[PDB]
Amino acid sequence: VTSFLHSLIIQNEPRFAMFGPGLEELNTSLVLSLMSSEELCPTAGLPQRQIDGIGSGVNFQLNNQHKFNILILYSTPQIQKVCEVVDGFIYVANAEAHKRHEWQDEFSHIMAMTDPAFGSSGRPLLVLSCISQGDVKRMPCFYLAHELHLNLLNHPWLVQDTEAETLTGFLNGIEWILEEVESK
């Protein structure tokens, strides 16, 4: 490359910010199943990667040769530093049919969190349409993309169906956002 005899500028594994109504409104917790399970190797984050008042997140991997880090947030000054260091965003939506939404707020929430003032706009946004378990009535993903007006945000996106208990769909979604990363 531009350097044949000197080591290169360090590249740390991809980091993502994860938030959303799906992290509390579901009868079954998504984070617990992610933590309390495998093929994924969840480990505590390194103190060096600490982000003041937030921590260093949780580490995962797909197959020993593919690792990423995630900063889980259950609320919304400090988060801004996250919006800058992070490579991508992950919004967990409640896709259970019996639910009624305030599509106006949800849009704004995302809007705020994802401003180009904190970083590029080529940074991917992954939307997880989640439900507790396979026998729950779910609202189709098309309706969700439509009601959230995802095009106004200007960030390339993807909506993927997920199940909190078995984690169905989680892999295919993660795999996708890891590519919009190697696109950078």
């Binding site: 189709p140 993903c141 098309f142 993309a145 439509h146 995802l150 095009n151 390339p156 996106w157 993807l158 909506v159 993927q160 169906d161 169905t168 769909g169 892999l171 295919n172 979604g173």
Partner: protein, 203 residues
Amino acid sequence: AGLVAEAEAVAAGWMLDFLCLSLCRAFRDGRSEDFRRTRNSAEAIIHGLSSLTACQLRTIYICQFLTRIAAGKTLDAQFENDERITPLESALMIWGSIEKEHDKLHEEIQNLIKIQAIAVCMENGNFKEAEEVFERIFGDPNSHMPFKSKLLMIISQKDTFHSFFQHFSYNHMMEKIKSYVNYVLSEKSSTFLMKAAAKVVES
């Protein structure tokens, strides 16, 4: 093998493009019954999707737009949870969501839909409804579509102002929309399922 679930997403992406292209053809040729059947197949396939991108979303919006236009003169049909919206007002909302590809043509089709949405009410004798539609489209103290002053007058003088609606008729709206559908047919005519399907027919 969760790879299967990912292979189903691919096959689904292919079927969606194929149904759209087939719906566009029924629209251009006037085959009502073909349009209806292809519409029901597309509806179900959309309900079964497990993932979605901006490209697939746009393809869905195109199918939705055509179903509203096909019912442009059926004044009492309802397409949105809000019962007050007429078919043409519904088509206009959808057209605002389809990202522009041909700026000029897009703006022309938009102006013609706004005009006809009121005209179809005026020509049927529904002076009151036309007034309601006008309020929902231009109702907002601001500068949009410069035909606002003209259409307001036409409404006050409660009588079909044929003179104006003649130069921006339903037929002129239909012609422009059918020129757009041809630009869609050319682009999608090269999609996986259609292409592979032709080779078999050539043999």
